[PDB]
Curated annotation (Swiss-Prot):
One of its GO terms (biological process) is positive regulation of gene expression. Changing residue 131 to A: Strongly reduced affinity for catecholate-type ferric siderophores. The gene is LCN2. This is Neutrophil gelatinase-associated lipocalin. Belongs to the calycin superfamily. Lipocalin family. Glycans are attached at residue 62. Keywords: Apoptosis, Cytoplasmic vesicle, Disulfide bond, Glycoprotein, Immunity, Innate immunity, Ion transport, Iron, Iron transport, Pyrrolidone carboxylic acid, Secreted, Signal, Transport.
């Protein structure tokens, strides 16, 4: 067995209006992370990592996440392909990811120069996962934006223990 909080219907996940793909480019720090498989591991807490979005000439994003683990910097790469509407994407070259049958990204909201919330839903080995990240253009964000992200995650069925705030580090994300 594996038990998961159901994914919310897309009807409850807002889409940022007039999404500007070019302003969304660059480096974003994950200051908040919530999902049905996200768990506040109370001893060794999650280290902040970052995600860089660069618009390709064809307008798909090359997405690079960088995290600090086992004393090195690991680079996780993937392609986000414009989906049904602006601000929505699907994963490119899905065939190359074993077990992956579905992957959707939806930019919930953002002001481009400070913060963003982004929703992800993917089906892996037939399991439906979903997560929300609170991106900060810097490593810190006000308590107002953070609780608002907690509010939004709860509205999607998540409990406090499935919501974390990665502690800021300087390695690999600076
Ligand atoms: O739950 C997710 N990931 C966790 C478990 O596979 C994790 O620990 O990264 C998850 C959910 C939706 C979309 C994703 O890219 C994703 O990594
Ligand atoms: O698998 C990862 O390391 C990862 C990192 C950042 C964002 C993601 O969705 C990931 O799956
Ligand atoms: O981004 C991916 O390609 C991916 C593949 C498998 C599992 C994941 O979480 C991913 O984010
Ligand atoms: Fe992932």
């Amino acid at each position: 067995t594996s038990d998961l909080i159901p994914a919310p219907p897309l009807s409850k996940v807002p889409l940022q209006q007039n999404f500007q793909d070019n302003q969304f480019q660059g480096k974003w720090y994950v200051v908040g992370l919530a999902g049905n498989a996200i768990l506040r591991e109370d001893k060794d807490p999650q280290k902040m990592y970052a995600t860089i979005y660069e618009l390709k000439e064809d307008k798909s994003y090359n997405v690079t996440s960088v995290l600090f683990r086992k004393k090195k910097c690991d680079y996780w790469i993937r392609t986000f392909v414009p989906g049904s509407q602006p601000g929505e994407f699907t994963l490119g070259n899905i065939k190359s990811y074993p077990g992956l049958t579905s992957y959707l990204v939806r930019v919930v909201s953002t002001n481009y120069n400070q913060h963003a919330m982004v929703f992800f839903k993917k089906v892996s080995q037939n399991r439906e996962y979903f997560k929300i990240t609170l991106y900060g253009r810097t490593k810190e964000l006000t308590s107002e934006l953070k609780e608002n992200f907690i509010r939004f995650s709860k509205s999607l069925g998540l409990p406090e223990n499935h919501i974390v705030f990665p502690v800021p580090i300087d390695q690999c994300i600076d």
